[PDB]
Amino acid sequence: MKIFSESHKTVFVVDHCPYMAESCRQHVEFDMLIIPLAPISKSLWTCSVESSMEYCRIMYDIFPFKKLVNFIVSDSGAHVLNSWTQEDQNLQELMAALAAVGPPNPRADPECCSILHGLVAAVETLCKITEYQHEARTLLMENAERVGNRGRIICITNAKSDSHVRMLEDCVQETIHEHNKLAANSDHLMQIQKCELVLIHTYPVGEDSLVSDRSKKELSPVLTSEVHSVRAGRHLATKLNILVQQHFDLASTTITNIPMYDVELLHHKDAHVDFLETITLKWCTPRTNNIELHYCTGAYRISPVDVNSRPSSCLTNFLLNGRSVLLEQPSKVISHMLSSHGGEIFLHVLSSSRSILEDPPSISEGCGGRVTDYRITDFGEFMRENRLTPFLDPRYKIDGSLEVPLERAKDQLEKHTRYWPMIISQTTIFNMQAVVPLASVIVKESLTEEDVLNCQKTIYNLVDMERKNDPLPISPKRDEQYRIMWNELETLVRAHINNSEKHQRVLECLMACRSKPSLWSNRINTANSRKHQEFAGRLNSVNNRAELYQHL
Amino acid sequence: PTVVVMDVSLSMTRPVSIEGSEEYQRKHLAAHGLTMLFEHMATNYKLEFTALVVFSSLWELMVPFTRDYNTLQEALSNMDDYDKTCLESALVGVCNIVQQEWGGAIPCQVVLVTDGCLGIGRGSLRHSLATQNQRSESNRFPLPFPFPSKLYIMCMANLEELQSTDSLECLERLIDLNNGEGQIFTIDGPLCLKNVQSMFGKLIDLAYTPFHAVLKCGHLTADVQVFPRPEPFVVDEEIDPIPKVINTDLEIVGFIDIADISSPPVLSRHLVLPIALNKEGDEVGTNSANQIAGKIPNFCVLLHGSLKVEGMVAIVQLGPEWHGMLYSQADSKKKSNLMMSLFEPGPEPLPWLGKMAQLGPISDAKENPYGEDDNKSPFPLQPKNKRSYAQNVTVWIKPSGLQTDVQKILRNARKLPEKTQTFYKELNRLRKAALAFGFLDLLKGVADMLERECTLLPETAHPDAAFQLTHAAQQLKLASTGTSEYAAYDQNITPLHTDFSGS
C-alpha cells in the first residue's frame, strides 16, 4: 500500500493555438543598473507552465523512485513516450519530453485549431499508464496535487463566452477520455469506471474576461470543471508559492547568517511532530566555532525557489556539502535541522530537546573508563577477517548455497567477538606473544578446527611456561599477578563458553588439567450452566458407584 | 509557549444558574481551581512560557514570558469585568498576546473564554466574530492565526439552556468556519471542570519519556546500546504505522571514510559505552557498579582511533540491513567524543552512495571508492545521474526567481563554472530552459538577451565562445516549429576547460 503517494501523476499542458497566443502585456526590463528591437511579448501561459512544471518537479523530488511523472506540452502533432525506470523519474526527462513535444507558436496549422490534440497530449503526459490506470491516482489527488499544480490537464485558451468555454471544455474532456480509453486498450491499464478532473485555466493579462465568479465544484460526472485566475508579476509568485505550500502542506522558513529577497525552505507534512511550522531561525555551518550537534527528525527533500539570491543559494551550498546545520533562536536548543547529500537537498523539523550529543567532556569515571591502552593485537586480528563492502544487490559468492551478504556480514561480526578481549590494560599476561594466538584465532579469517589446534598449542606452551616456574610482571607478589592474569583469561573465555560449544569443551579440558589453586426452564438452565467443573469419580461411576484404590 | 484566556468580561461576571462554583465570585472559583491551561505545561510541556492577561476588547497585558502559574491565577482572579464580551475575539486576542509575549515562533494553545449570554438580536457577539463566508477582497484575514491552536468554548449545563442561549450552536458554527477549532459539545448536566480541561488540555503535545534501555553486542570490548524511540516518517508503511519502542539491539559493522561523506541523518543521541553479559543467568547488559568495570579497559569510550589520521568512520548496520556511518572526534588529550546514530529516513539513507539495501560482506563487493581510507572520491557523480531535487530546471515560485534568473544567466561568470559539481547549477538550468522553451520570439527583450551580453566583441574573435554557444542557439529555434525538437535536458552541459588562452 506504499504505491499510493500524492505525486503519482502530474501533467502541465501548454498549447500553441491563436487563442492562447495573445499578448499578455508582460514586459520586464533588465537594462536598469541582429534583430529589430521589438517589445518583449512574453505570454502569461509560459509563466503558468513554468510554475506548474516547478510544482511537478517538487512532486518528483518528493517521491524519487516509487512514483514517476513526466511533462508533455501541446502542439500541432502529438509525441507520446513514457518509461518505467527509477533513474529517469527526475524532472530532467520531463523537461526533455516537454521540449520534444512542442513549444508555443503564434502561427498554428491551417486546420484542426482546437484543444482536442492538446487534451490527448495532456492525457498522455499524465502518468500511471497515460491517465488510464490513474483512477486511484486522481482519487488521491482530489485535494493534494489539485492544490499543487494542474495534475490532469491545463487548457489555456481565450474563451469568447461562457458557452464557448463550456463547449471547449467538453471537447477537451471527450478527447482526454478517448485518449485514456486508448491507453486502457493495453493490459497493465484498466478502463476508467469513474473520472476525476482538476482543471486549470490560464488567461493573458489585460485580455478578454467573460467569466463570472464561481467556486470549485464537480460540474459534471464525466468531467469536473474548475476555473482559477492568476495575474503576472508578484501575484503570480504569491499564487505559485501558495500552490507549492498547499501541495505537501508545507511552510516557509528563512536562513540567515551565511558563514562567508524572500527566503523559503520547503518540506513535507512531517512537521506535525514539532508543532502544538514557519521555522524562524538562522543557519549554522558545522565546524568547531559553532555547535554542530542537533536532533534530526523527518528528513524530506526540499527544492529551493529563491536559489537566484545570495542567502538561499549560500544556505543550499552549505547544506549540500554534507554538513549538519544546527538551529538557534532568532543550554542550547535547536528547533530546526538541515541535512543534504551530493545532489539531494533536504530540510528537517527538529524537536527542541536532546541537542547534547557531545555531552561527555571526560571519560575517567565511566565504565570502561580511564584506560585507553586497549589490545591492538585483538583489534587487528578482528580486522584481519573483517572485510565488509556493500554492492548494489546481494550476490552468492561463497559456499553454503546462495549466501545472503547480510548473513555473511553478521557472521563476520559475530566471529570478531567469540573469544578476543580487545582491551589489554586489564591484565598483565598480554605482554606474552604466545598467548595472543587464542584471542586472534577466534577472530582471524582462518577460524576452524585448525584454529582450535593452534589454541591447543598455545595452551601447551603456556603449560610449559607454568612448569618453568617463571614469575611475570604486573606493570605485590608474583602470585597476585598470576592470579589476575588467570582470572582475566577465565573472564575472556567465559563469554566464549556461552558463545560456542568448542570453547566450553576447551574450558572443560583445561579444568580437567588444572592444579595449584418457560420460567422454570430458563432459571434452571441459568442455575445449571453456572456450575463450573465435575471430577473423576462422577463421570466414571457405574450403577451410581465407583471403585477406589484401583492402582492395585 | 502557553496561551491563557482570562475571561475579563462584564457578561462573565455572574453565576451560571443559581450560584458560583466555590460559593462566591468567579475569582474565588478560579483561585480554588483552574482548567488544564497550566497543569499540562506543569506536568509535560516544561519548556513553555505563559502570558497571564485578562482582557476582552484591548490587549491589557502585563505578564511577560514566564511559566509562573501563580501569575496566571492572579490574572484569572483579576479578571473581574470589562466593557466587551466576545468569545472568538477573546480567543484571538489571547492567542495574539501569548504569541507576542511568550514567543513569536513558539507554539501555544488558546481557547475561547467568555460568557456569551447576550441574547440573539442587536448585541449578538457571534455575528461580529463569525465573519468568514464572504469578503473575498480581505480573504487573508486574522483567522486562522499563524499558530496551531483550537479555540474551544466551554459548555457544561442543560441542553435546553445551551440551545436557548445558542452557546453550543454558535461554537459549532465557529468550529465549522474555522475547520475544527473546537471539540464536539458532548456534555450536559452539572459538570465540573472536566469538559473544559479536556478541551483545553491539548497544550502538552511536546512531551517526552525519560526511560532507558540496553542491548547485547556479543563478547567485544566496545558494545552499543539503542537510544529511545525515534520520530516516525514515511519510509515503509507495511501493514500499519505505530509509535516506536525501545529497540532490542544494533550491530557495529562496516568501516568507511570519515571526512569524505560523513554520515546520514541521525535519529537520536546514543553514546558509545561497552557492556557485558557472559554467564550471569539471564545476563543483563552491564546500577552504580560501573566504577569497578570502569577500572577494566574498554575501547568504546576511546573509539576515536582512525577517525582523522587514516580516515575511517565506524559504520553500524542493524538487523534489517539498516546500515549507517558515524564519525568521532579527533582530539584525545582534550575532550574527545563518541556516539551512535541511525541513518536517513528518506528513500535512500546515502543518496551520494547509491542504494544501501545490500549492507553485506566484501565477497561480492561491486566497488570500494573509499575502503576506510578515502583513497578515491568519485562521489557524487556530476555527469548525467543525480537526485531529482536539483534537476535542470529553474524555479520561480518566490520573488527571486525568473527575473533574477535572467540576470544570473546574463552574469553567469560570477557563480559559474567554478562550483559546478553540486552547488552552482542555475546557469545550466537557465540555458536548458532557454533551449527547451524556444524563446526566440521573446528574445527581443530580456528573456534570451543573456547570450548577446557575452558577445559584445567583434565577429572575428576566437571560435571557442562560438563553439560553446553553437548548440544552444541552434537547438532553441527548433522548438518554435511545434514538432519534435532537441531534447538536451537529460544530458547535462558540463564545464568545458578554457585552455585556448596563451597564458
PDB file of C-alpha atoms in Angstrom, chain A residues 121-262:
ATOM      1  CA  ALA A 121      -1.187  15.198 -25.264  1.00  0.00           C
ATOM      2  CA  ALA A 122      -2.029  16.210 -21.674  1.00  0.00           C
ATOM      3  CA  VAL A 123      -3.674  12.826 -21.008  1.00  0.00           C
ATOM      4  CA  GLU A 124      -0.534  11.146 -22.342  1.00  0.00           C
ATOM      5  CA  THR A 125       1.594  13.460 -20.181  1.00  0.00           C
ATOM      6  CA  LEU A 126      -0.262  12.300 -17.061  1.00  0.00           C
ATOM      7  CA  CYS A 127       1.461   9.248 -15.575  1.00  0.00           C
ATOM      8  CA  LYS A 128       0.120   5.901 -14.268  1.00  0.00           C
ATOM      9  CA  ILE A 129      -0.367   4.291 -17.695  1.00  0.00           C
ATOM     10  CA  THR A 130      -1.316   7.543 -19.511  1.00  0.00           C
ATOM     11  CA  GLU A 131      -4.323   8.514 -17.348  1.00  0.00           C
ATOM     12  CA  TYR A 132      -5.955   5.076 -17.787  1.00  0.00           C
ATOM     13  CA  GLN A 133      -4.740   3.364 -14.607  1.00  0.00           C
ATOM     14  CA  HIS A 134      -4.504   6.778 -12.878  1.00  0.00           C
ATOM     15  CA  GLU A 135      -8.045   6.426 -11.460  1.00  0.00           C
ATOM     16  CA  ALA A 136      -6.701   5.823  -7.954  1.00  0.00           C
ATOM     17  CA  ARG A 137      -4.007   8.454  -8.528  1.00  0.00           C
ATOM     18  CA  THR A 138      -6.680  11.053  -9.294  1.00  0.00           C
ATOM     19  CA  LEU A 139      -8.749   9.753  -6.366  1.00  0.00           C
ATOM     20  CA  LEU A 140      -5.862  10.626  -4.041  1.00  0.00           C
ATOM     21  CA  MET A 141      -5.083  13.834  -5.968  1.00  0.00           C
ATOM     22  CA  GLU A 142      -8.543  15.227  -5.167  1.00  0.00           C
ATOM     23  CA  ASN A 143      -7.001  17.575  -2.584  1.00  0.00           C
ATOM     24  CA  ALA A 144      -3.213  17.019  -2.853  1.00  0.00           C
ATOM     25  CA  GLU A 145      -1.940  17.515  -6.407  1.00  0.00           C
ATOM     26  CA  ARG A 146      -5.027  19.615  -7.185  1.00  0.00           C
ATOM     27  CA  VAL A 147      -3.825  22.186  -4.655  1.00  0.00           C
ATOM     28  CA  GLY A 148      -0.283  21.766  -6.015  1.00  0.00           C
ATOM     29  CA  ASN A 149      -0.363  22.019  -9.801  1.00  0.00           C
ATOM     30  CA  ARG A 150      -2.810  21.060 -12.549  1.00  0.00           C
ATOM     31  CA  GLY A 151      -2.266  17.294 -12.371  1.00  0.00           C
ATOM     32  CA  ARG A 152      -4.693  16.321 -15.122  1.00  0.00           C
ATOM     33  CA  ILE A 153      -4.860  18.916 -17.911  1.00  0.00           C
ATOM     34  CA  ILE A 154      -4.195  22.662 -18.124  1.00  0.00           C
ATOM     35  CA  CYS A 155      -6.112  24.082 -21.100  1.00  0.00           C
ATOM     36  CA  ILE A 156      -5.255  27.754 -21.664  1.00  0.00           C
ATOM     37  CA  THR A 157      -7.453  29.480 -24.241  1.00  0.00           C
ATOM     38  CA  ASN A 158      -9.132  32.829 -24.895  1.00  0.00           C
ATOM     39  CA  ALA A 159     -12.750  31.953 -24.179  1.00  0.00           C
ATOM     40  CA  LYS A 160     -15.173  34.090 -26.171  1.00  0.00           C
ATOM     41  CA  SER A 161     -18.080  33.417 -23.792  1.00  0.00           C
ATOM     42  CA  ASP A 162     -19.264  31.041 -21.074  1.00  0.00           C
ATOM     43  CA  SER A 163     -20.964  28.819 -23.671  1.00  0.00           C
ATOM     44  CA  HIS A 164     -17.792  28.698 -25.790  1.00  0.00           C
ATOM     45  CA  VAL A 165     -15.694  27.910 -22.700  1.00  0.00           C
ATOM     46  CA  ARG A 166     -18.081  25.104 -21.708  1.00  0.00           C
ATOM     47  CA  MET A 167     -18.103  23.669 -25.250  1.00  0.00           C
ATOM     48  CA  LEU A 168     -14.293  23.766 -25.487  1.00  0.00           C
ATOM     49  CA  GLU A 169     -14.030  22.131 -22.051  1.00  0.00           C
ATOM     50  CA  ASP A 170     -16.476  19.411 -23.132  1.00  0.00           C
ATOM     51  CA  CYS A 171     -14.478  18.757 -26.315  1.00  0.00           C
ATOM     52  CA  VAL A 172     -11.211  18.589 -24.345  1.00  0.00           C
ATOM     53  CA  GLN A 173     -12.821  16.237 -21.810  1.00  0.00           C
ATOM     54  CA  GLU A 174     -14.093  13.958 -24.594  1.00  0.00           C
ATOM     55  CA  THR A 175     -10.647  13.894 -26.232  1.00  0.00           C
ATOM     56  CA  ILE A 176      -8.983  13.154 -22.874  1.00  0.00           C
ATOM     57  CA  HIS A 177     -11.463  10.335 -22.202  1.00  0.00           C
ATOM     58  CA  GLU A 178     -10.786   8.930 -25.684  1.00  0.00           C
ATOM     59  CA  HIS A 179      -7.019   9.042 -25.065  1.00  0.00           C
ATOM     60  CA  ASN A 180      -7.490   7.377 -21.663  1.00  0.00           C
ATOM     61  CA  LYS A 181      -9.566   4.636 -23.313  1.00  0.00           C
ATOM     62  CA  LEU A 182      -6.867   4.218 -25.983  1.00  0.00           C
ATOM     63  CA  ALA A 183      -4.303   3.821 -23.196  1.00  0.00           C
ATOM     64  CA  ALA A 184      -6.708   1.378 -21.488  1.00  0.00           C
ATOM     65  CA  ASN A 185      -6.504  -0.886 -24.575  1.00  0.00           C
ATOM     66  CA  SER A 186      -3.282  -2.283 -23.051  1.00  0.00           C
ATOM     67  CA  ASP A 187      -3.161  -4.919 -20.300  1.00  0.00           C
ATOM     68  CA  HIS A 188      -1.408  -3.113 -17.433  1.00  0.00           C
ATOM     69  CA  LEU A 189      -4.074  -0.378 -17.626  1.00  0.00           C
ATOM     70  CA  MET A 190      -7.743  -0.706 -16.684  1.00  0.00           C
ATOM     71  CA  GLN A 191     -10.707   1.071 -18.262  1.00  0.00           C
ATOM     72  CA  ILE A 192     -11.970   4.130 -16.394  1.00  0.00           C
ATOM     73  CA  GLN A 193     -15.053   3.236 -14.354  1.00  0.00           C
ATOM     74  CA  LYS A 194     -15.054   6.721 -12.796  1.00  0.00           C
ATOM     75  CA  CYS A 195     -13.482  10.017 -13.831  1.00  0.00           C
ATOM     76  CA  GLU A 196     -11.988  12.813 -11.729  1.00  0.00           C
ATOM     77  CA  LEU A 197     -10.739  16.032 -13.327  1.00  0.00           C
ATOM     78  CA  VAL A 198      -8.887  19.029 -11.888  1.00  0.00           C
ATOM     79  CA  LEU A 199      -8.825  21.805 -14.484  1.00  0.00           C
ATOM     80  CA  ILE A 200      -6.506  24.818 -14.585  1.00  0.00           C
ATOM     81  CA  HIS A 201      -7.457  27.794 -16.760  1.00  0.00           C
ATOM     82  CA  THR A 202      -4.952  30.465 -17.792  1.00  0.00           C
ATOM     83  CA  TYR A 203      -5.671  33.795 -19.465  1.00  0.00           C
ATOM     84  CA  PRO A 204      -3.397  36.642 -20.573  1.00  0.00           C
ATOM     85  CA  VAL A 205      -3.178  39.812 -18.514  1.00  0.00           C
ATOM     86  CA  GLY A 206      -5.189  42.666 -19.992  1.00  0.00           C
ATOM     87  CA  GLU A 207      -7.229  40.330 -22.209  1.00  0.00           C
ATOM     88  CA  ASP A 208     -10.915  39.467 -22.597  1.00  0.00           C
ATOM     89  CA  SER A 209     -12.774  38.437 -19.435  1.00  0.00           C
ATOM     90  CA  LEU A 210     -16.241  36.904 -19.845  1.00  0.00           C
ATOM     91  CA  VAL A 211     -16.168  34.624 -16.793  1.00  0.00           C
ATOM     92  CA  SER A 212     -18.301  35.055 -13.676  1.00  0.00           C
ATOM     93  CA  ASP A 213     -17.262  34.386 -10.090  1.00  0.00           C
ATOM     94  CA  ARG A 214     -17.747  30.760  -9.060  1.00  0.00           C
ATOM     95  CA  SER A 215     -16.466  28.263  -6.510  1.00  0.00           C
ATOM     96  CA  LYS A 216     -14.790  24.889  -7.025  1.00  0.00           C
ATOM     97  CA  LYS A 217     -17.425  22.253  -7.802  1.00  0.00           C
ATOM     98  CA  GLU A 218     -17.685  18.954  -9.672  1.00  0.00           C
ATOM     99  CA  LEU A 219     -19.746  20.316 -12.564  1.00  0.00           C
ATOM    100  CA  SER A 220     -20.343  17.021 -14.377  1.00  0.00           C
ATOM    101  CA  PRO A 221     -19.842  13.318 -13.608  1.00  0.00           C
ATOM    102  CA  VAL A 222     -17.903  12.893 -16.871  1.00  0.00           C
ATOM    103  CA  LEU A 223     -15.576  15.820 -16.136  1.00  0.00           C
ATOM    104  CA  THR A 224     -15.240  18.113 -13.122  1.00  0.00           C
ATOM    105  CA  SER A 225     -14.516  21.708 -14.142  1.00  0.00           C
ATOM    106  CA  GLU A 226     -12.541  24.237 -12.093  1.00  0.00           C
ATOM    107  CA  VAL A 227     -11.578  27.806 -13.006  1.00  0.00           C
ATOM    108  CA  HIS A 228      -8.899  29.958 -11.376  1.00  0.00           C
ATOM    109  CA  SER A 229      -7.429  33.371 -12.178  1.00  0.00           C
ATOM    110  CA  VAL A 230      -3.715  34.185 -11.953  1.00  0.00           C
ATOM    111  CA  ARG A 231      -2.039  37.513 -12.690  1.00  0.00           C
ATOM    112  CA  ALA A 232       1.505  38.281 -13.887  1.00  0.00           C
ATOM    113  CA  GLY A 233       4.240  39.523 -11.551  1.00  0.00           C
ATOM    114  CA  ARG A 234       4.203  39.432  -7.750  1.00  0.00           C
ATOM    115  CA  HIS A 235       0.674  37.983  -7.788  1.00  0.00           C
ATOM    116  CA  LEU A 236       1.929  35.072  -9.908  1.00  0.00           C
ATOM    117  CA  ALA A 237       4.761  34.486  -7.422  1.00  0.00           C
ATOM    118  CA  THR A 238       2.318  34.578  -4.492  1.00  0.00           C
ATOM    119  CA  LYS A 239      -0.028  32.128  -6.245  1.00  0.00           C
ATOM    120  CA  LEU A 240       2.862  29.782  -7.097  1.00  0.00           C
ATOM    121  CA  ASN A 241       4.160  29.907  -3.511  1.00  0.00           C
ATOM    122  CA  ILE A 242       0.667  29.191  -2.147  1.00  0.00           C
ATOM    123  CA  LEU A 243       0.302  26.280  -4.585  1.00  0.00           C
ATOM    124  CA  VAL A 244       3.708  24.869  -3.583  1.00  0.00           C
ATOM    125  CA  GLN A 245       2.829  25.182   0.117  1.00  0.00           C
ATOM    126  CA  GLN A 246      -0.575  23.539  -0.399  1.00  0.00           C
ATOM    127  CA  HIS A 247       0.952  20.702  -2.468  1.00  0.00           C
ATOM    128  CA  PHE A 248       2.542  18.989   0.553  1.00  0.00           C
ATOM    129  CA  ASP A 249       1.114  21.066   3.467  1.00  0.00           C
ATOM    130  CA  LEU A 250       4.430  22.896   3.775  1.00  0.00           C
ATOM    131  CA  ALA A 251       5.564  26.153   5.377  1.00  0.00           C
ATOM    132  CA  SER A 252       8.119  28.927   4.799  1.00  0.00           C
ATOM    133  CA  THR A 253      11.490  29.291   6.525  1.00  0.00           C
ATOM    134  CA  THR A 254      14.320  31.788   6.113  1.00  0.00           C
ATOM    135  CA  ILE A 255      18.018  31.012   6.588  1.00  0.00           C
ATOM    136  CA  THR A 256      20.388  33.811   7.589  1.00  0.00           C
ATOM    137  CA  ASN A 257      23.988  34.327   8.758  1.00  0.00           C
ATOM    138  CA  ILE A 258      25.800  32.567   5.925  1.00  0.00           C
ATOM    139  CA  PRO A 259      29.405  31.947   7.057  1.00  0.00           C
ATOM    140  CA  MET A 260      31.218  33.812   4.283  1.00  0.00           C
ATOM    141  CA  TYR A 261      14.744  38.813  -1.459  1.00  0.00           C
ATOM    142  CA  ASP A 262      12.333  36.293   0.047  1.00  0.00           C
TER     143      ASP A 262
END
